[PDB]
Design a binder for this molecule. Structure first.
Ligand SMILES: Nc1ncnc2c1ncn2[C@@H]1O[C@H](COP(=O)(O)OP(=O)(O)OP(=O)(O)O)[C@@H](O)[C@H]1O
Ligand SMILES: Nc1ncnc2c1ncn2[C@@H]1O[C@H](COP(=O)(O)OP(=O)(O)OP(=O)(O)O)[C@@H](O)[C@H]1O
Ligand SMILES: Nc1ncnc2c1ncn2[C@@H]1O[C@H](COP(=O)(O)OP(=O)(O)OP(=O)(O)O)[C@@H](O)[C@H]1O
Ligand SMILES: [Ca+2]
Ligand SMILES: [Ca+2]
Ligand SMILES: [Ca+2]
Ligand SMILES: [Ca+2]
Ligand SMILES: [Ca+2]
Ligand SMILES: [Ca+2]
Lengths: 310, 310, 310
DNA sequence: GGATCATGTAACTGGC
């Protein structure tokens, strides 16, 4: 895991400065080592003469320099992949939902974006031997569509105790794009105390359509969204968590997701879920750096996402 | 219930600013805490130096941060669900129409969308022990199809006095999509004085088809509809009311509702009502985050929506 | 290849000064001969009386003066051009990706910018007879989208041993625009020990959008980007390497790359990759000093970039 | 013993 920022005290930085960084939003040596000098200068008391030291001290602990592709490949092969609850889907994602990267599943209504985010909120608590991620879940909602009774229905399918599952899911609701980005700063706090394995934002773009209405507000909403998606990338790098965000679609004037190019570039995996028949949906890999563009065929059963009981 | 915005006076904000917010459309601390900084800046007198304070003061009263899924589940289990007037329907919706979320029932003509909205306007006044919601009703109409004589016919079935029922239903007619959105701002006013348990918009999209005619006006009508549906979500969150909106259908060129993706995403529950035989209709769950896609079989009797008297 | 800066010791400069230059960022006589007097003065110990000598001594070894266009043309005709993995693309680039110049491929998501950078990371190790570049690869990533399993899939297609290929690719991740420019200084170190044939930055502008947010920060981000792109040009001139950088696009408010004029001028070749159908993309020459503006039609197969298997 | 001037980018539905 990541080293808490209090470790920096043992290096030459007084607690007055460290406690100035924790108030800014840094609760981990990684989060400071990743930050550029410009952000440290931007703190009310962190003078230039300090930030140069803080950065040079933090870089001593974390590896910034190069490495051969072998160490990366060997380390990457040990990355956790949370099971989706569907053998057909994991066969498509080659194991499951990666961690340390941003996955985005978009699709027309009813296609089960919130349902996948609900099983993932549970299976991410399974032991690694069972495909899970061995950690708590973190569910930021922007719709009011968080239904814990759907967490129990899948918790019982996997044998876990419904009591503990509803205790290892930290829920919060965003009421506007400002609160939504603010909950991420409070998220970095909680993520250094307990171990989280999955952070969910559902939906990641639902509030941006309405908070920025005028045609002149469009360039400002994509840039506010860009910082939000970058904040999400910082949590994945620093905490080794798995970020799953949910998008919405729009008609090409056939379905095409919203958010624009800023979200299509930032996302590493895009899953396009369309409805098939009855309760069986069709997930297709829209974008990925390693998976071939293919399709699967999962379902939405009374016990969460599963396979098409045909 | 929600705290009126005058409570904010006891914190450091002068009445000149509070009375500037009430003129904007905020009559509740929640409605201010949910609003983003951008909207407060947009008021004629609320400078940046104030909005940062107003937001930071309002957030002290209402909970914005995280919480475990247990507190949510325990609190969610105590949510009110208004009876539909049909045992078969409540068995489908698992208790009745939820509050604090947007329910949408669409369907071909005659299929009883206005009739369901008429019984709901009455049963939402029943005591909670009888399945109701213990509160007044709020009926925005965009068709002229509000018939109070149908409110009496169901008021007498439930034993309530027809006099009081027609006194606890606040009716208003929208003549265009602008007036329709304007009535919501006057709705937040009335909802903080009295206690409302149900807000109805029938129909929610009937006026959008005609107010925006040209093919180039389509992107502007979906965005005006997006703000309207977001205004509806703010009332459900802030006032804990139950929003029921009515849609229309169109032929796939078999029935498919209008409004597009902006209304399908925003709605949490979509009910598809088709005609069966005689006076018996068939409600089917088109979209929901917790209910399985099933069907029921209600009817339209002389005393409102009921069960198929077979 | 380029002469290491220790060769300058055999001329009249003491090791104290040379070791002062290597700490600055010069590890090659060329890199010193190219540097202006102003930069040498800027070192903590290199007085004016030294820099004039160091420059005049370095210029004795490397050719700075004029030459006829014949020697250049004869020498230019012997420049290496790394194969893209697609016969259709090499026919467009007339042989492949040039070395000693900055190539930039931009395009909407999914269009295979990271995939091209992945095959190029492998084929640049092929012997020159097979179209490669006979050298190691250098992959600076700013997205976390470096997938070594895609390096193996193309390594096996070309018969090379997957073990050695993942040993000749030096990977590093940039977490902000400061670290990104810092990795170039550590790159000049490694490039004088081993022989590199290709340096990759993917993406070259992804971090600049977010690190500089305010409208007033725009003039400072283009200038920080200008130095970065100049650092890239110094590596191409001094080390004879091939620099391939990846850009992102934005909507004209159809696709137009970001970075502004500073990156459009600095780039010598700009390739515009759009999606065609299925797995077949379309690369078009946006800017080049010698190639006509044409298009090709490659693909993204399970073994990397290739030709459209039609 | 004794004063003085100059530049630089960025998305979005609707029957017979
Ligand atoms: N308990 C359940 N058992 C079976 N199916 C269910 C259950 N709860 C919901 N569903 C089904 O799951 C689907 C709802 O999916 P979900 O709520 O994830 O959609 P979504 O992509 O979030 O949509 P939107 O854009 O409207 O928010 C519907 O088909 C619904 O019938
Ligand atoms: N008093 C009544 N007793 C019995 N049935 C009635 C009564 N009033 C209306 N109905 C029936 O209810 C149906 C009308 O339903 P309703 O007005 O809710 O339709 P709707 O979905 O709003 O339609 P539209 O799209 O045309 O507005 C018809 O079948 C009509 O015969
Ligand atoms: N192993 C594979 N086999 C076949 N196709 C693949 C494979 N891995 C990825 N792809 C395809 O390659 C494309 C991804 O391209 P790439 O990752 O290079 O895009 P990009 O230009 O970097 O995008 P972005 O801006 O999102 O980073 C997708 O169409 C994906 O389906
Ligand atoms: Ca949802
Ligand atoms: Ca992407
Ligand atoms: Ca009606
Ligand atoms: Ca919905
Ligand atoms: Ca990429
Ligand atoms: Ca150029």
């Amino acid at each position: 895991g990541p080293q808490p920022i209090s470790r920096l005290e043992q290096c030459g930085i007084n607690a007055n400065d460290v406690k100035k960084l924790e108030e800014a939003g840094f609760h981990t040596v990684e989060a400071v080592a990743y930050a550029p000098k410009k952000e440290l200068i931007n703190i009310k008391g962190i003078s230039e003469a300090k930030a140069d030291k803080i950065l040079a001290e933090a870089a001593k602990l974390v590896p910034m320099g190069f490495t051969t592709a072998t160490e990366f490949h060997q380390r990457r092969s040990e990355i956790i992949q949370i099971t989706t609850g569907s053998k057909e889907l994991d066969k498509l994602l080659q194991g499951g939902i990666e961690t340390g990267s941003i996955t985005e599943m978009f699709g027309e209504f009813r296609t089960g974006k919130t349902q996948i985010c609900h099983t993932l909120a549970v299976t991410c608590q399974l032991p690694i031997d069972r495909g899970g991620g061995e950690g708590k879940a973190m569910y930021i909602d922007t719709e009011g569509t968080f239904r814990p009774e759907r967490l129990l229905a899948v918790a019982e399918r996997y044998g876990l105790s419904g009591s503990d599952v509803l205790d290892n899911v930290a829920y919060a609701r965003a009421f506007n794009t400002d609160h939504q980005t603010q909950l991420l700063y409070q998220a970095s706090a909680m993520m250094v105390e307990s171990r989280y394995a999955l952070l969910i934002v559902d939906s990641a773009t639902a509030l941006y359509r309405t908070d920025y209405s005028g045609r002149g507000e469009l360039s400002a909403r994509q840039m506010h969204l860009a910082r939000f998606l970058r904040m999400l990338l910082r949590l994945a790098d620093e905490f080794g968590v798995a970020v799953v965000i949910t998008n919405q679609v729009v008609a090409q004037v056939p379905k095409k997701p919203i958010g624009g190019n800023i979200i299509a570039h930032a996302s590493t995996t895009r899953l396009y879920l369309r409805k098939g028949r009855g309760e069986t949906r069709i997930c297709k890999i829209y974008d990925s750096p390693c998976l071939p563009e293919a399709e699967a065929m999962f379902a939405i059963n009374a016990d969460g996402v599963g396979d098409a009981k045909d």
